[PDB]
Design a protein around this motif. Sequence first.
Motif, PDB file in Angstrom:
ATOM      1  N   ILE A   1       0.876  -1.756  -0.395  1.00 13.08           N
ATOM      2  CA  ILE A   1       0.135   0.382  -0.219  1.00 13.08           C
ATOM      3  C   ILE A   1       0.976   0.885  -0.375  1.00 13.08           C
ATOM      4  N   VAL A   2       0.739   2.430  -0.832  1.00 12.90           N
ATOM      5  CA  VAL A   2       1.407   3.883  -0.846  1.00 12.90           C
ATOM      6  C   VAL A   2       1.609   3.804   0.644  1.00 12.90           C
ATOM      7  N   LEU A   3       2.706   4.849   0.352  1.00 10.04           N
ATOM      8  CA  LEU A   3       2.971   5.590   1.947  1.00 10.04           C
ATOM      9  C   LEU A   3       4.032   6.882   1.800  1.00 10.04           C
ATOM     10  N   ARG A   4       3.220   7.838   2.294  1.00 11.16           N
ATOM     11  CA  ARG A   4       3.842   9.004   1.734  1.00 11.16           C
ATOM     12  C   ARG A   4       3.243   9.905   2.801  1.00 11.16           C
ATOM     13  N   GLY A   5       4.009  11.625   3.650  1.00 11.65           N
ATOM     14  CA  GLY A   5       4.069  12.270   4.393  1.00 11.65           C
ATOM     15  C   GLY A   5       2.552  12.619   4.430  1.00 11.65           C
ATOM     16  N   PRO A   6       1.430  11.984   5.711  1.00 15.38           N
ATOM     17  CA  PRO A   6       0.109  12.834   5.770  1.00 15.38           C
ATOM     18  C   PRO A   6       0.606  14.356   5.536  1.00 15.38           C
ATOM     19  N   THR A   7      -0.707  14.529   5.448  1.00 20.87           N
ATOM     20  CA  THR A   7      -1.415  16.620   5.120  1.00 20.87           C
ATOM     21  C   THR A   7      -1.801  16.782   6.016  1.00 20.87           C
ATOM     22  N   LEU A   8      -0.930  17.504   6.468  1.00 22.19           N
ATOM     23  CA  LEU A   8      -1.892  18.332   8.092  1.00 22.19           C
ATOM     24  C   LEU A   8      -1.519  19.910   7.430  1.00 22.19           C
ATOM     25  N   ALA A   9      -2.912  20.404   8.407  1.00 25.16           N
ATOM     26  CA  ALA A   9      -3.584  21.454   7.691  1.00 25.16           C
ATOM     27  C   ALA A   9      -4.037  22.311   9.056  1.00 25.16           C
ATOM     28  N   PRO A  10      -2.969  23.300   8.675  1.00 23.98           N
ATOM     29  CA  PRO A  10      -3.122  24.217  10.209  1.00 23.98           C
ATOM     30  C   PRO A  10      -4.502  24.440  10.086  1.00 23.98           C
ATOM     31  N   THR A  11      -4.417  25.268  11.517  1.00 19.45           N
ATOM     32  CA  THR A  11      -5.993  25.610  12.038  1.00 19.45           C
ATOM     33  C   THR A  11      -6.121  26.753  12.758  1.00 19.45           C
ATOM     34  N   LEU A  12      -7.305  27.121  13.335  1.00 19.90           N
ATOM     35  CA  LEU A  12      -7.067  28.401  14.331  1.00 19.90           C
ATOM     36  C   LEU A  12      -7.231  29.435  14.001  1.00 19.90           C
ATOM     37  N   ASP A  13      -6.162  30.326  14.557  1.00 24.26           N
ATOM     38  CA  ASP A  13      -6.363  32.090  14.692  1.00 24.26           C
ATOM     39  C   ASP A  13      -7.242  32.800  13.670  1.00 24.26           C
ATOM     40  N   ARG A  14      -7.927  33.808  14.009  1.00 22.79           N
ATOM     41  CA  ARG A  14      -8.943  34.373  13.506  1.00 22.79           C
ATOM     42  C   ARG A  14      -9.020  35.376  12.358  1.00 22.79           C
ATOM     43  N   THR A  15      -9.875  35.178  11.593  1.00 21.77           N
ATOM     44  CA  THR A  15      -9.579  36.375  10.222  1.00 21.77           C
ATOM     45  C   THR A  15     -10.123  37.046   9.890  1.00 21.77           C
ATOM     46  N   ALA A  16     -10.013  38.500   9.936  1.00 18.01           N
ATOM     47  CA  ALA A  16     -11.594  39.139   9.470  1.00 18.01           C
ATOM     48  C   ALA A  16     -13.202  39.377  10.518  1.00 18.01           C
ATOM     49  N   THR A  17     -12.163  39.621  12.074  1.00 21.37           N
ATOM     50  CA  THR A  17     -13.007  39.361  13.235  1.00 21.37           C
ATOM     51  C   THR A  17     -12.499  40.682  14.052  1.00 21.37           C
ATOM     52  N   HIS A  18     -14.233  41.625  14.482  1.00 16.04           N
ATOM     53  CA  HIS A  18     -13.708  42.626  15.083  1.00 16.04           C
ATOM     54  C   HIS A  18     -13.033  43.983  14.807  1.00 16.04           C
ATOM     55  N   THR A  19     -13.472  44.095  13.215  1.00 11.64           N
ATOM     56  CA  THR A  19     -12.534  45.692  12.412  1.00 11.64           C
ATOM     57  C   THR A  19     -12.467  46.538  13.909  1.00 11.64           C
ATOM     58  N   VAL A  20     -11.180  47.619  14.150  1.00 12.79           N
ATOM     59  CA  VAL A  20     -11.020  48.270  14.559  1.00 12.79           C
ATOM     60  C   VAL A  20     -10.899  49.772  14.019  1.00 12.79           C
ATOM     61  N   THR A  21      -9.425  49.321  13.230  1.00 15.54           N
ATOM     62  CA  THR A  21      -9.745  50.969  12.421  1.00 15.54           C
ATOM     63  C   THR A  21      -9.241  52.088  12.515  1.00 15.54           C
ATOM     64  N   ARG A  22      -8.298  51.993  14.031  1.00 14.92           N
ATOM     65  CA  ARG A  22      -7.754  53.062  15.348  1.00 14.92           C
ATOM     66  C   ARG A  22      -6.304  53.309  14.381  1.00 14.92           C
TER      67      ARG A  22
END
Lengths: 51, 51
Positions: A1-22
């Motif tokens: 059976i094929v063996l290869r480096g498992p693909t891991l997707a980073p998660t967490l963080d926060r994008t476009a949350t509570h815009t302040v603009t000051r």
Amino acid sequence: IVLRGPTLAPTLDRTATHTVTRPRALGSFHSTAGPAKHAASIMAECKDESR
Amino acid sequence: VTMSPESVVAAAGGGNNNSGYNEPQRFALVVIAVNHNVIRIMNGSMGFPIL
């Protein structure tokens, strides 16, 4: 059976949350002041030619 | 300030009768300002405390 480096997707963080603009910082450069003043005109109370 | 095509075509003459712009036209830009000031009354006279 094929063996290869498992693909891991980073998660967490926060994008476009509570815009302040000051980011603004007050302050500027221009002339300092003006040295101007005036007196209360000139009064005149004289008659009868008192020498 | 930016002029207008009507202004740039009326600057030259060539207008027909009762057109107003028959002769070449001249224009002048004028600007007026309205501001504030302080007047002080004392000793039976007047003067500018800040000038």
